[PDB]
Write an enzyme that holds these catalytic residues in place. Structure first.
Site, PDB file in Angstrom:
ATOM      1  N   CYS A 113       0.798  -1.220   0.000  1.00 55.57           N
ATOM      2  CA  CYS A 113       0.000   0.000   0.000  1.00 55.57           C
ATOM      3  C   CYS A 113       0.832   1.272   0.000  1.00 55.57           C
ATOM      4  O   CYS A 113       0.264   2.353  -0.169  1.00 55.57           O
ATOM      5  CB  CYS A 113      -0.939   0.010   1.204  1.00 55.57           C
ATOM      6  SG  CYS A 113      -1.764  -1.566   1.515  1.00 55.57           S
TER       7      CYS A 113
ATOM      8  N   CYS B  21       0.711   3.175   6.385  1.00 55.21           N
ATOM      9  CA  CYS B  21       1.022   1.820   6.805  1.00 55.21           C
ATOM     10  C   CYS B  21       0.651   0.849   5.695  1.00 55.21           C
ATOM     11  O   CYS B  21      -0.248   1.102   4.895  1.00 55.21           O
ATOM     12  CB  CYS B  21       0.266   1.460   8.079  1.00 55.21           C
ATOM     13  SG  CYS B  21      -1.520   1.391   7.859  1.00 55.21           S
TER      14      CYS B  21
ATOM     15  N   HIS C  52      -9.451   3.578  -1.321  1.00 58.29           N
ATOM     16  CA  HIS C  52      -8.072   3.132  -1.156  1.00 58.29           C
ATOM     17  C   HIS C  52      -7.654   2.251  -2.323  1.00 58.29           C
ATOM     18  O   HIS C  52      -7.667   1.018  -2.219  1.00 58.29           O
ATOM     19  CB  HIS C  52      -7.900   2.391   0.167  1.00 58.29           C
ATOM     20  CG  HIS C  52      -6.525   1.848   0.377  1.00 58.29           C
ATOM     21  ND1 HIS C  52      -5.390   2.582   0.121  1.00 58.29           N
ATOM     22  CD2 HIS C  52      -6.101   0.639   0.812  1.00 58.29           C
ATOM     23  CE1 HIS C  52      -4.324   1.852   0.393  1.00 58.29           C
ATOM     24  NE2 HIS C  52      -4.728   0.669   0.816  1.00 58.29           N
TER      25      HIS C  52
END
Lengths: 436, 710
Positions: A99, A422, A392
């Site tokens: 990510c 994160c 996201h």
């Protein structure tokens, strides 16, 4: 200078940052349906070049990356270069760091650019959760390799003789960690349980994030960062993010089933970001190159840091580890930091992160630093909402934060922004931005 | 106050009261008479201030909830009356706790063993954490003593006899998931929300709905109880041979409780516990338990240890794979193998892989765990990577000059503070050291193949051996799930030294026209698992003869074996399982019967005349051989402590636990009576039965063995 390291080039010029762009994000079925991940990046890159005054010959290298990966065209950056209208002499390049992929792309471009080998580059990321690669069972691949290598006809029948059971059924993709078997959200449930985050303590964060984002569109402040995507059917254009639902009352989604635990699951679907599709890009350029071709820089870059932690409990504490390191590298303090940002991939985990950066014991023992890294004011935290709203896309949420933060500091007329994220596998990233 | 009343009460703001359990002695939560007294006061106080939601119990300690009932006070009992009184009061207290009308919840975290489940079975609802450390189980039959306080008859009612019976008979450990599936525990939660989850489980009121069993447990009382009880009794009689008490008593007491009411079960359990704690087996097992606990708590050397983080193994094969698997998969230490031949490395790796894949096929370990554990084992054929190994274990053929070569090169191509451990079984440790730059760091770590099976290891120092070395080796052996023992450097060490006369007399009797069934039954009836000949078959006849020539060279003709038997098998290679073509043939039809005995093995051996005597004679003669050898070796301070030798004998060879070990056996048999037995055996048989001088001295003067034993 026992901890500060400047990010300057060999000639003494700072790493300026020039415009960026963001495809509006969409849920996994509404639009972009069937649209691969490559052509989203093609859209954003092509129309980012066709928006400023830079000739395409200045760009010398572009770096993308994608988490969900299609077996064809492994090095998607080369197809970004080839498909769009660009000089075919650009050193296309692809990375992958879950990510935080866009952060790694920006870091690679910055370090290569300050090494002296490049003078301008493109860094970004594209992602699509609607063209999922659905592979066949592992057993029904060795059979295929053998029959490809099989020599006589009678050998092939003897080979398929072992074909049995439900080997024909496709294998759905897995989001759980390879080495842990944890579904990336059930590692947030236990974090919430450990640090005591109430379903009412959260689900107010989600509300305050849907607001300040619906308000952001209504004010139109994020007009110059978002394309107007056009889809090959060309039935109607997509202009606004559809994930945002800045109209629900906080008492409306308090009545939802827990998602993972289903017994004490203080986290649910509404307070967790959904899988989306999108792309984003940023143009990095040294200060001298920008100056000599007449271009105003949209801020700069100050320092960055990447960190890893053990993936067996609370792996989602990446920002907590990364932030103090980035601050000490930039020679700054949390106090003198106008505006910050967080990935907020889930309700809680982010709240747990604020609690931890506010806790003296954590920095006392888990980091060895004398003092805690400071607490964060609500007003200086996710001013324009966060990922519990937009969505996201795994590889794209990096550069979006840089663009938004630079523009917001442009409105406030100064300051030093900060961005953290994160990632799965216990990977955390942070960087400090300076909008002059 | 706080110290005495470990059951501190605390009423929260709502209608719920929480009771902690903090015994101020040590980290295990044990049960004492003082607790039994004080819980009455606490519950009487709880009767005051009625109309509250309920109560909960918590461990309030990081490791366990309740370790178990203290056994030290049990040893202070005198007759059956005291034990019956203690059992009666415990049963009454549990019944009183079960007699409350409000919700009582047991929130258990960590170990909960022994009588703790009693209390847990007293409560209406139970919740346990998911930590792998926590466990449920009743381990008192293994102590030779039924856990009679009420749970003996509550557990079969709560969960069907099909599992409760094997829980009681074979007291074992239960995972949290296993208990949840079985119905023992209502729910499982992470440790963080344990107290809270217990609280709302208490707040929910009176679950007046007993969950249904498998419906196959309705056999108890009517037809079906008789069949199941008869079958399990026959199974236990075939298995334990019926020399273990507290097995049929359990069956009788469970039958009485189920088919005659709970009061009948209570009184039967009380009487059985009263009469059964005084059987010699009980204090024998308790003594072994105490000895094992002491040796586990024993620090070995008196010096501080040294850090150990990596380990090296020289040589490979089946054995080297054994040490590697034990050191890596169990203790979690990186291990590097250095076989000269790649085939040896492959063999060791295949052995470890077979072990772990067998574990996984049961679905006890995740497939990722196999990789995460195999990551610790790496082989090679050179000396690179050995420069930072704290320990090296040598496991290649026992040629002397070869071992000096190995020690020379490990000194040349490794660190300076590292210590060298040899897996030798024949050569003296000092002689192996002999000349070396750092002889003070040479130790002997004697193992017992298969390594993962026998939990006993031997630590052999020599004339110069730094105490830090012994400390480090002992701590390692502890980490590997073994039982370290310090042994003086003498020829034959201890275990196989006393094992040799066993097989020696077995072969001597076999020469005199004896059959397989008679000898095997005679030795297994005397509490010995796996009788002699199949012991040799397991270890291999090639290793069966062992190195007993050095035993004769050291101690005369006493260890001399009969001829034309070891010779008659080595030439016609019959190694048992090493070559497969032993006298226990494999691959028999069905493969569901006793291992077949060859017909030609009797002609192969002399087999003179026909057999005589009876099983008691066989048992007594072999046992007195081991006893004489053991007293002989302990006479010259081979073994530092009497308990160390006794635990080694009972726990590595396989001496009958219910006899408590050789020293317990002679103490029970007493004095010169066994001496006279052995002179008469010598006179009727031969000079091998000459008593040890210390043996006759103690027998005539009436001295004891276990300190103030007598």
């Amino acid at each position: 200078m026992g901890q500060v390291l400047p990010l300057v080039t060999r000639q003494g010029d700072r790493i300026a940052i020039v415009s960026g762009l963001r495809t509006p994000f969409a849920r996994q079925a509404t639009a972009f349906h069937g649209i691969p991940a490559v052509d989203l990046g093609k859209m954003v890159v092509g129309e980012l070049l066709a928006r400023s005054e830079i000739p395409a010959e200045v760009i010398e290298q572009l770096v993308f990356g994608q988490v969900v990966q299609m077996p064809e065209a492994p090095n998607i950056a080369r197809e970004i270069v080839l498909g769009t209208g660009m000089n075919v002499h650009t050193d296309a390049y692809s990375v992958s760091r879950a990510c935080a992929t866009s952060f790694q792309a920006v870091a690679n471009v910055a370090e290569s650019l300050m090494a002296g080998t490049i003078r301008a580059g493109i860094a970004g990321g594209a992602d699509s959760s609607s063209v999922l690669p659905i592979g066949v069972s592992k057993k029904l691949a060795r059979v295929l390799v053998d029959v490809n290598k099989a020599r006589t006809m009678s050998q092939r029948l003897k080979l398929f003789s072992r074909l049995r059971l439900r080997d024909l059924m496709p294998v759905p993709p897995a989001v759980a960690e390879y080495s842990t078997g944890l579904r990336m959200g059930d590692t947030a449930e236990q974090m919430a349980k450990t640090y005591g985050i109430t379903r009412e303590q959260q689900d107010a964060l989600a509300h305050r994030s849907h607001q300040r984002a619906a308000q952001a569109w209504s004010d139109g402040k994020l007009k110059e960062e978002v394309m107007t995507a056009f889809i090959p059917p060309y039935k109607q254009p997509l202009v606004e993010d559809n994930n945002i639902r800045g109209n629900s009352s906080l008492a409306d989604y308090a009545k939802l089933r827990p998602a993972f635990d289903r017994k004490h699951g203080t986290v649910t679907a509404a307070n967790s970001t959904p899988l989306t599709d999108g792309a984003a890009a940023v143009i990095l350029m040294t200060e001298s190159r920008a100056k000599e071709l007449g271009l105003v820089p949209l801020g700069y870059l100050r320092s960055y840091a990447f960190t890893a932690i053990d993936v067996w409990q609370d792996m989602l504490l990446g920002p907590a580890w990364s932030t103090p390191l980035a601050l000490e590298r930039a020679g700054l303090t949390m106090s003198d930091l106008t505006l910050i940002d967080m990935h907020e991939a889930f309700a809680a985990q982010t709240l747990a992160n604020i609690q931890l950066l506010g806790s003296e014991r954590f920095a006392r023992e888990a980091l060895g630093r004398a003092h805690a890294t400071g607490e964060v004011d609500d007003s200086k935290f996710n001013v324009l909402g966060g990922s519990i709203a937009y969505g996201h896309p795994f590889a794209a949420t990096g550069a979006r934060m840089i663009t938004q933060t630079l523009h917001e500091l442009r409105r406030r007329g100064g300051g030093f922004g900060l961005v953290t994220a994160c990632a799965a596998g216990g990977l955390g990233a942070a960087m400090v931005l300076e909008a002059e | 106050m706080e110290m005495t009343s470990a059951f501190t009460l605390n009423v929260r703001l709502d209608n719920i009261a929480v009771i902690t359990i903090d015994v101020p002695g040590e980290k295990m939560n044990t049960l004492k008479a003082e607790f039994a007294s004080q819980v009455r006061a606490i519950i009487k106080q709880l009767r005051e201030n009625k109309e509250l939601r309920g109560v909960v119990f918590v461990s309030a300690k990081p490791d366990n909830f309740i370790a178990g009932a203290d056994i030290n006070m049990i040893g202070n009992c005198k007759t059956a009356q005291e034990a019956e009184a203690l059992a009666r009061q415990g049963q009454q207290l549990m019944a009183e706790i079960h007699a409350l009308p409000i919700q009582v919840i047991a929130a258990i975290h960590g170990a909960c063993l022994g009588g703790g489940l009693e209390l847990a079975l007293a409560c209406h609802g139970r919740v346990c954490t998911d930590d792998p450390k926590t466990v449920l189980g009743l381990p008192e039959v293994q102590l030779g003593l039924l856990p009679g306080s009420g749970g003996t008859q509550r557990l079969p009612r709560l969960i069907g006899v099909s599992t409760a019976l094997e829980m009681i008979l074979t007291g074992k450990q239960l995972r949290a998931k296993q208990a949840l599936k079985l119905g023992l525990v209502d729910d499982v939660v992470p440790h963080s929300i344990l107290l809270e989850a217990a609280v709302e489980l208490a707040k929910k009121e009176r679950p007046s709905s007993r969950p249904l069993p498998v419906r196959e447990r309705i056999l108890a009382g009517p037809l079906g109880r008789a069949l199941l009880f008869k079958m399990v009794g026959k199974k236990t009689e075939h298995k334990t041979q019926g020399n273990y008490p507290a097995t049929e008593r359990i069956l009788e007491v469970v039958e009485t409780g189920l088919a005659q009411g709970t009061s009948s079960g209570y009184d039967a359990e009380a009487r059985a516990f009263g009469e059964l704690a005084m059987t010699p087996q009980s204090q024998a097992l308790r003594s072994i338990f105490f000895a094992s606990t002491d040796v586990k708590k024993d620090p070995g050397s008196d010096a501080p240890p040294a850090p150990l983080n990596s380990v090296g193994i020289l040589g490979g094969g089946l054995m080297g794979g054994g040490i590697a698997y034990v050191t890596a998969c169990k203790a979690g230490i990186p291990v590097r193998i250095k076989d000269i031949n790649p085939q040896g490395i492959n063999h060791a790796l295949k052995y470890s892989w077979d072990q772990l894949e067998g574990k996984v096929r049961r679905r006890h370990l995740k497939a990722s765990e196999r990789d995460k554990q195999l990551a610790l084992i790496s082989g090679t054929t050179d000396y690179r990577g050995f420069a930072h190994r704290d320990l090296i274990i040598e496991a290649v053929f026992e040629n002397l000059e070869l071992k000096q070569q190995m020690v020379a090169e490990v000194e040349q191509n490794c660190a300076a503070h590292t210590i060298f451990a040899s897996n030798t079984s024949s050569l003296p440790i000092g002689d192996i050291a002999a000349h070396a730059t750092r002889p003070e760091q040479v130790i002997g770590l004697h193992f017992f193949s298969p390594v993962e099976k026998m939990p006993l290891v031997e630590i052999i120092p020599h004339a110069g051996t730094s105490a830090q070395t012994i400390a480090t080796t002992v701590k390692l052996a502890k980490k590997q799930g073994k039982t370290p023992i310090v042994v003086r450097d003498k020829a034959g060490f201890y275990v196989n030294r006393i094992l040799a006369p066993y097989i020696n007399e077995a072969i001597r009797m076999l020469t005199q026209g004896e059959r397989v069934e008679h000898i095997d039954a005679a030795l297994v009836k005397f509490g010995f698992p796996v009788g002699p000949i199949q012991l040799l078959d397991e270890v291999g006849i090639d290793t069966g003869t062992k190195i007993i020539p050095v035993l004769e060279a050291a101690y005369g003709e006493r260890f001399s074996a009969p001829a034309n038997v070891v010779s008659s098998i080595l030439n016609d290679d019959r190694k048992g399982r090493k070559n497969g073509r032993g006298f226990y043939l494999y691959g028999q039809k069905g493969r569901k019967s006793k291992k077949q005995v060859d017909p030609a093995i009797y002609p192969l051996i002399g087999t003179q005349g026909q057999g005589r005597i009876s099983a008691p004679q066989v048992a007594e003669r072999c046992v007195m051989l081991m006893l004489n050898e053991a007293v002989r070796c302990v006479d010259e301070q081979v073994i530092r402590s009497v308990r160390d030798g006794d635990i080694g004998a009972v726990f590595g060879i396989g001496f009958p636990p219910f006899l408590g070990g050789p020293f317990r056996y002679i103490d029970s048999l007493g004095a010169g009576e066994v001496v006279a037995i052995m002179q008469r055996l010598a006179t009727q048989y031969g000079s091998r039965f000459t008593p040890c001088e210390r043996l006759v001295e103690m027998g005539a003067r009436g001295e004891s063995f276990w300190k103030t034993t007598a």
